[PDB]
């Protein structure tokens, strides 16, 4: 089980490449109004339209 | 305009409160912008010139 952790970390790192694709282009730039909570927040994109959107892996 | 940029520390210390905006008034051609232009040229930096018709977009 101490070894299983080390393998799970290996699987993890390969699994991380999956979040990395969304993190790269195409991306739109917004501006952070404020954080209402961890999992979702209130943001205002650079279109003059505001959206209530999710935070990827609970960014601090 | 010029001195708090250089030494904020002296400008706060003296008894004048931390930098706040300046309003320049007068009748046309008096060089309200001229003194602002002059100082910005010497500095080469710590100046952002924005046009007030750049705020606006088509869309």
């Amino acid at each position: 089980i101490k070894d299983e952790q080390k393998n799970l970390k290996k699987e993890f790192l390969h699994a991380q490449e999956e979040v990395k694709r969304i993190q790269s282009i195409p991306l739109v730039i917004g501006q952070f109004l404020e954080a209402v909570d961890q999992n979702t927040a209130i943001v205002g994109s650079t279109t003059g339209s505001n959206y209530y959107v999710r935070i990827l892996s609970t960014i601090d | 305009v010029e001195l708090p940029l250089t030494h904020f520390e002296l400008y706060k210390q003296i008894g004048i409160d931390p930098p706040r905006g300046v309003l320049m008034y007068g009748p046309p051609g008096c060089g309200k912008t001229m003194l602002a232009k002059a100082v910005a040229h010497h500095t080469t930096a710590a100046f952002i010139r924005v046009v007030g018709s750049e705020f606006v977009q088509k869309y």
């Binding site: 209402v36 209530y52 | 008894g15 009748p27």
Partner: protein
């Protein structure tokens, strides 16, 4: 969440057009102490504006009807304007500014046609102050004919305010108007039965000047010997700005010179500088706005 518009989570914050307005206009910082030398004025203003919004109960009990309208009048540079706004900071009223022009007000896009609708909304965020402002250098093209654009707004507001709902013997929404004449007023404002008292501020005095100046002079170092009186006497003023400028200017002279303290000699040079700037405006026939 889009293309269905089904709700996700409630954002706990409340938003109305009125809350943004209050923030943008910006309540002043200046305390009644700072302004002082107008000590005689802070008592007079206090009674008509502040007392009925704070406790409308006391007055409902006596059996009166609380003044709809309050006119402050006098110079716009004896610091009358500064103090008028200081009553709004001190109360924690929402600062609704109406000029009879669309300054930035959003609602339908004007709040100068908005008499009835404004009172309501202001009620929700009670107490509130509808503010009306004249300085006669902004809106100098709306001073003729009807004799002030701001005057139309006042006339209408007080009249509806006189009787709606059960709100004649209750008061929590005030209108402060500042005016620079006794001519800007309309006949309805003059006759009592809705406007209790009209307040007047003197033009800047030497005596009052000493105290406003003393408080600003505290912000920097002083040295042995009092020459606060000497510097007060010399300026003829023209504004609260002018008073405030004597101090700021003494710092600019000290900085050039590279002092680590502020000296008594600096104030002497500053007043004299400031004085000269006043004289240039005096020659041109100008206030503090060009």
């Amino acid at each position: 969440r889009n293309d269905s518009y089904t709700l996700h989570k409630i954002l706990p914050n409340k938003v109305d057009p009125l809350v943004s307005l209050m923030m943008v206009e910006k309540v002043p910082d200046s305390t009644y102490e700072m302004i002082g030398g107008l000590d005689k004025q802070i008592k007079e203003i206090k009674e008509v504006i502040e007392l009925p919004v704070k406790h409308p109960e006391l007055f409902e009990a006596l059996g009166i009807a609380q003044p709809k309208g309050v006119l402050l009048y006098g110079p716009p540079g004896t610091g009358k304007t500064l103090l008028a706004r200081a009553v709004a900071h001190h109360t924690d009223c929402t600062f609704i500014r109406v000029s009879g022009s669309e300054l930035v007000q959003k609602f339908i896009g004007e709040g100068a046609r908005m008499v009835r609708e404004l009172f309501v909304m202001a009620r929700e965020h009670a107490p509130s102050i509808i503010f009306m402002d004249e300085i006669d250098s902004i809106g100098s093209s709306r001073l003729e004919g009807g004799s002030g654009g701001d005057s139309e707004v006042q006339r209408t507001m007080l009249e509806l305010l006189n009787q709606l709902d059960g709100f004649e013997a209750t008061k929590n929404i005030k209108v402060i108007m500042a005016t620079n004449r006794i001519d800007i007023l309309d006949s309805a404002l003059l006759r009592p039965g809705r406007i209790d008292r009209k307040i007047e501020f003197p033009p800047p005095n030497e005596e009052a000047r000493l105290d406003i100046l003393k408080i600003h002079s505290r912000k920097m170092n002083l040295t042995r010997g009092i020459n606060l009186r000497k510097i007060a006497e010399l300026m003829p003023g023209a504004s609260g700005a002018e008073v405030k400028g004597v101090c700021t200017e003494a710092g600019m002279y000290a900085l050039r010179e590279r002092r680590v303290h502020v000296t008594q000699e600096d104030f002497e040079m500053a007043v004299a500088k400031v004085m000269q700037k006043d004289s240039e405006k005096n020659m041109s026939i100008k206030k503090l706005w060009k």
